[PDB]
Design a protein around this ligand. Structure first.
Ligand SMILES: Nc1ccn([C@@H]2O[C@H](COP(=O)(O)OP(=O)(O)OP(=O)(O)O)[C@@H](O)[C@H]2O)c(=O)n1
Ligand SMILES: Nc1ccn([C@@H]2O[C@H](COP(=O)(O)OP(=O)(O)OP(=O)(O)O)[C@@H](O)[C@H]2O)c(=O)n1
Ligand SMILES: O=C(O)C(=O)c1cn(-c2ccc(O)c(O)c2)c2ccc(-c3ccccc3)cc12
Ligand SMILES: O=C(O)C(=O)c1cn(-c2ccc(O)c(O)c2)c2ccc(-c3ccccc3)cc12
Ligand SMILES: O=C(O)C(=O)c1cn(-c2ccc(O)c(O)c2)c2ccc(-c3ccccc3)cc12
Ligand SMILES: O=C(O)C(=O)c1cn(-c2ccc(O)c(O)c2)c2ccc(-c3ccccc3)cc12
Ligand SMILES: [Ca+2]
Ligand SMILES: [Ca+2]
Lengths: 209, 211
């Protein structure tokens, strides 16, 4: 059936790329594929889905989904900021670069005979939790974060991050943590099995509110 | 038709990735497409082709080609050192990072000092001139030049040909240029990857019958 009908969902997926110059950048190895499966499952279940995609050019756009393409952690931030006020659910599956080149060159860098000075990018997810706390996001019912974790075990850092981020749900790479104390293990199955579990926890959270 | 039959060709393509830690790296936006097409056109004309591939645009291994996948500029260097004694033709199409982080972290990191990576094309030219690659008949380099306030595309293409010392330098104007070590400069007319890959290999085969 269709448990996400009427639900407007904003999802980010993939890594961002922080440009050093026109051609080079700082990036990561994340694939974006678990984020895409969640966007896809959500649309399969009736949600009106907008997907902000980073470094995911080899992936198939999920059917029924509004595509928004970004490169950078700041571009991801502004795309979320543009699309956040109208959505009911936000899923932050993207590996958002926490740092950026301090200055980006306008032409291909060719050095002498060196270093990269860095500056910090905004925590988009924490900006979203905050904006809802300040009354800026009245349509928002569920903020979902992502974490790959492994001085404590996988669960020391996962609760510690759930608390620190102040969001409704944290999906850990597996575990699924709610801001109301519940935790469900994620048996290591396919990405479609995972995505379904994630969307069931979402609808369950939406219904609990 | 099958002019390249019997020619052992070593090809690099893609962009290297310089790790900062197990998940993050420095990279570039090179697709690998023109270098794969060269390696394909080379194979379809009879050459026995080895392709050392960095990061590409999801490109599939060309059929008939021996594949070596690498990550970093240093790994690219090691794989070229390994395979170059067999080759008769080296085609350096990869974008090889000229810098890497001085320290790679053993776990997700929670300024980046850079140190320089070796010039692999230049180490090839020096090695053949020192007599360590008797089988190597042709060393091809690639370049993507834009032209600026100091010189047009060709001004920069000429300086790079002379600095590097290779037999042929394929220049994409960011048309384009094919510059030979005898001073011949042929324009690269616009085309698809396959058409231009045929022009590049044409150029290699003319250089080889000329030697
Ligand atoms: N600038 C950032 C960084 C992260 N995220 C979000 O925060 C969550 C992951 O946070 P985090 O665990 O801090 O990512 P890491 O940088 O890998 O974590 P850590 O600092 O603990 O290593 C994800 O939903 C991601 O989309 C974000 O919105 N903005
Ligand atoms: N460390 C390097 C850098 C470049 N290359 C090869 O050298 C050729 C020229 O690449 P390019 O980056 O233009 O050479 P640089 O002189 O390093 O470039 P720039 O002028 O931008 O500094 C290419 O075929 C490339 O595969 C290489 O073998 N090893
Ligand atoms: O969607 C993907 O496959 C992707 O690329 C991911 C990127 N991150 C991510 C986010 C924030 C970070 O700070 C960071 O280092 C990495 C993920 C975190 C978790 C998961 C995941 C969750 C549950 C089950 C399986 C996998 C998937 C990804
Ligand atoms: O210097 C060169 O000629 C030079 O190739 C580079 C200089 N940088 C660079 C940038 C910003 C800095 O702050 C700085 O110190 C140095 C680079 C960064 C990345 C790469 C690269 C990485 C992967 C594939 C291909 C190329 C190459 C260079
Ligand atoms: O194979 C590809 O298409 C690829 O990805 C390339 C990577 N470089 C490259 C190498 C060294 C650099 O420093 C750098 O910035 C980039 C290329 C240079 C030229 C060409 C090319 C040549 C002739 C016609 C069309 C394209 C293609 C590539
Ligand atoms: O600190 C963190 O938690 C943290 O996320 C990072 C710290 N660095 C970093 C590395 C080398 C350095 O020399 C240094 O000063 C700081 C990063 C570099 C890249 C990324 C990144 C880029 C794209 C997507 C996802 C992540 C994330 C971090
Ligand atoms: Ca360089
Ligand atoms: Ca971090």
């Amino acid at each position: 059936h269709h448990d996400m009908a009427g639900v407007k969902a904003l999802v980010t997926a993939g890594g961002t790329r922080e440009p050093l110059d026109p051609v080079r950048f700082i990036g990561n190895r994340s694939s974006g594929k678990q984020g895409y499966a969640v966007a896809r499952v959500l649309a399969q279940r009736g949600a009106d889905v907008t997907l902000i995609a980073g470094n995911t050019a080899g992936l198939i756009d999920p059917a029924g989904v509004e595509m928004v393409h970004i490169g950078s952690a700041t571009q991801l931030r502004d795309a979320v900021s543009k699309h956040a006020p109208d959505a009911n659910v936000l899923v932050m599956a993207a590996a958002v670069a926490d740092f950026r080149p301090a200055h980006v060159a306008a032409a291909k860098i060719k050095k002498g005979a060196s270093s990269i000075d860095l500056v910090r990018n905004d925590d988009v997810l924490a900006g979203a939790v905050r904006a809802r706390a300040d009354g800026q996001l009245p349509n928002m019912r569920a903020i979902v974060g992502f974490a790959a974790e492994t001085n404590g075990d996988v669960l020391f850092h996962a609760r510690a991050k759930l608390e620190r981020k102040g969001c409704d749900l944290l999906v850990v790479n597996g575990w699924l943590l709610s801001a109301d104390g519940t935790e469900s293990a994620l048996e290591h199955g396919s990405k479609t099995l995972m995505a379904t579990r994630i969307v069931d926890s979402i609808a369950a959270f939406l219904k609990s509110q």
